[model samples]
Target: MEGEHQYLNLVREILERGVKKDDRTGTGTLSIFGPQMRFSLRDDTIPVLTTKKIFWRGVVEELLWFIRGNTDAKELAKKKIHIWNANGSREFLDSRGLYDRAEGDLGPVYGFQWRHFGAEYDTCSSDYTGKGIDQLANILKTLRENPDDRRMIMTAWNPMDLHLMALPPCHMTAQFYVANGELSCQLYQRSGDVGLGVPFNIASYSLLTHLMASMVGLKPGEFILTLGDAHIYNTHIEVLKKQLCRVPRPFPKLRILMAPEKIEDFTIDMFYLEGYQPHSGNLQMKMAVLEHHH
Candidate 1:
């Protein structure tokens, strides 16, 4: 039931285990279609897929963008990877009082904080925004300079940015730890779309872990993923049931195009995936973007 296993099977089990439907949560009793689930291994390294074909290139590129703290889809599009295209096409489009247009700066959300985490507002002081790449770079530097400090953390939670985002940060924050010189990471996702987002999220974060480990000169560690709202959506029930009947193919090989030293500047061309033949089928979902955040 653990360690480099099938994500589909693990997802099925997560919901089959005591999750209840609740109308109060706005997700409407949590039907199979909209559930949020996660996959990780105890050893700290999330295996890249070989079982099914995934957008491996997109995963690496988008993650690198997040780390660079660029919320503008234009910047993302510059890389030719548009995973967030369905959500919107322009950068901060909703921020300029032009929520309907596809171009506005939606505050500092991920990019802002990673590049510049600012002034003491409530709980956190003005610090550099913990964008994805900087987060990885900073963590490595810490591991080299302060391996004993167990509180190394990176976050995407900005109350100001949250107000402007189409959806508040689901994969909001993460923390890294060093145990006996081995590195492990824990991610806290407040909202997750199991059918759609989780798979990519897994790949992205796993690569981040790998990047950090190599930079810090340690073997990769376990990635512990925690969820606040993990449920199946009512809409995807039929598809979920269909997926359950088929056996997942062997895991595919995911090759990230990253140099050992230039982990931070890694780009889409740096990624390469091979032998990714999943059970033949398709599962698609949509983002409720342009919708207000809580």
Candidate 2:
């Protein structure tokens, strides 16, 4: 089966056999404890699922933002990326005592943690005095110098800083491995909204892996996704059923127009996808973001 079928099969398995469970959102789900999938990037295969249209720009830009160490949503909005709008809405920030926040300030979400994992945060403040580790830059350095170091990992889960974030990262920790002159990545996601989030996560990490490989002088290798609590939300059941009915096309080819010398300098215009033809129209579904709860 192709990469897309692996995801479609996962959806089918969850629908057929997953147990019903209550969740934080009060929108119940059919939940499975653990599920894993692997996509091979060894043969010029990009893992963008072809069963439905993916917002490619959003994925690329979001990853870039994280790599760039940005915590503000307005910066992403400048690129026309709006996926974080629900999580960073004004009301969401206000309830967290972050009243001074701008419209798209995501506090310390994924980007902050990736680039500044444990920095002391003052809501929406640009004058943060503490210095945090830059994991993305260090990972690139290790890949170039110590490919077999066994500790090439980055995590976004900080217990002390969780309260400072708009929302905790679901796709939390990632580890990279290099062998036989190829680079591979495995992401550990604590929660996956399979219907909406998993597809995006798959493509996001694949792109990350590809970029790391490109810059590190290695071939793009396998991209493995491991989930802790993978579930399909009750509201997304019908649309997921629609998604399962479609057939997956061939994986697309990714073209990096310019090879940036540094990861942080990567811009949106450098990445492009060619030959992605899904079965038909884009699948649309509403995603629920529960009010922030400590």
Candidate 3:
């Protein structure tokens, strides 16, 4: 099996060997603890799983949004990405007492925590001026200046500000490594929705690695994803089974149209995908949006 089959194998592993267990949403999952997958960007194989078509543009937009340190879903909406819609809904924000927030304000989500982790966060109304360290900036600096630094890591799990977020990050922390003039990244995802969310994440982080490497003048290396509660949602079992029946195709190549001098300056128009010929039919699954609005 090639790297493109990493996701399919994970799904099969869960179905064959996983334990059935109740979960937070009352829609139980077939889960296995601590599963890992490694994909190499070195051989020009981008890990956008070709078993099913991934919404590449949406993934690109969301990542650039995170890099820009914008927590508002309005920004993503402007770019036509609606993946965060369920989490940023009016019903959800109102329940969190984020009344001061504008519609689609995610209030210290992945972007906020990446750019302003330790800021004195209250309601969305509070000004977070000149507070919290920018981990993304630090990582880039470290990668370029101190490629051997073992501490090049970025995290989105701020316990103090979890209440302020529309939804806590499922993909929490990522650490970058540089060796032999190549940049590599390792992500530790606390939870993964194998059928839906994992494919999005696989491509998103791989794109991030490629961009960051290009910015620092290093080659894209390996992407290793380590998962904790890797599982298939009960509702997604059939959707994944359909995907599994299809054979894997060649993984796509990610093209950076223009290399921005700074990560924050990257735009959606600056990225494109080439040779991504996946099997027909989008494997649509009901995403588990853990709504605590009541």
Candidate 4:
């Protein structure tokens, strides 16, 4: 069954009631989107938007896609996704020296670190994503078999890969916890764009718990989010207001392939989407990269 609409409504109400302010990150400013929503439910239910037709399935698919360790803008462009459109523009080029992107050195960043952990152990190959699944499965198995070691973690942000990326990862690292064998995942996004990206963020990680719980023989649990720099872009104010005005549609469902139980074994094509219907329109939002570095 789908979750409640009140979660999203309350969150949106928080943003509406809250005042626009500067972020603690020191990089930029923000406008509140939906900062007031809260959820107290876990297990077999994930809090997806029932207000204004947020695309829950799309959020799931994109998250699975990212977990596959992809960085090609053209491929996303094929799906009509343009999140990294301004990546190579001259404006974004100024930040190259911060982490040595000029020398063609794209060291281990969040994805690489999460899926391919470089050199963590000698006997085992350093696969970051695989390590993540191992960690996840380990915790689940521990809870079921040993009933101890409740902390399970997966992280993405790596300062070493900062300059290689056109834009540093805003949603960096995450950790999942199990209490009495129930699954709850929390994320630590160093930077978050509230209006354009926060909804997707909430949906992605929340569903991650859903999928992981289903795999590990446990029930779903709460999603605790701790953000370092969560800010709404100055340009996305009107579109966010439109989200508040509109009523939410039915929560979408995720259809994942069960062929490979391990994380590293699954390819991009192994994932699929079904029954994702958002409100009958696209969001109108425009924000440009700051070519000029501060």
Off by over 4 Å in 4: 1-46, 53-61, 71-81, 88-94, 98-107, 118-147, 253-259, 265-277, 281-294
Q: Runs in model 3 with CA error above 4 Å?
A: 97-100, 122-130, 281-294
- Residue 152's lDDT within candidate 2 is 86
Query: Model-by-model lDDT, in order?
Result: 0.59, 0.84, 0.84, 0.53
* Candidate 1 lDDT, 1-294, residue by residue in tens: 443354666566655762656643565434333333334433433455534456766887778776565556656666687666645534434443445444423445564555555422221122344422455457678888998777688887877556556446678788887776677777787766666676677777777776677566776666766667665666666666655655555444445454556554666566455555665443322222323332
Report clashes for each candidate as comma-separated counts. 48, 0, 0, 17
- After best superposition, candidate 3 residue 5: deviation in angstroms? 1.7
**Which RMSD does model 2 reach against the true structure?**
7.0
Compared with the true structure, what per-residue lDDT tens digits does model 3 show for residues 241-288?
878877787788887778888788998788788899977753333222
What tens digits encode model 4's per-residue C-alpha lDDT throughout 1-294? 124454444445445654567654453344444233333335234455544455544564456545555444444455665554456334544555433233222334344445554324221113344442333445545655654454556655555545456666777767666677676677776656666576677777776666666566766667766666556555565666666665565554545456366543444465444454555444422211333333
lDDT per residue for candidate 2 within 1-294, as digits (tens), equals 657778988999899999999887578899997899999987768899888889988999988888877887777777889887777888988877777777778778887777776777655447543468788878989999999989988999888877677887788899999899999999999999999999999999999888888788899989999999999998999888978777677899888777688887888778788798765543433212232331
Question: Which of candidates 2 and 4 is the stronger one according to TM-score?
Answer: 2
Query: lDDT of candidate 4?
Result: 0.53
| Superposition TM-score, candidate 3 onto the true structure | 0.90
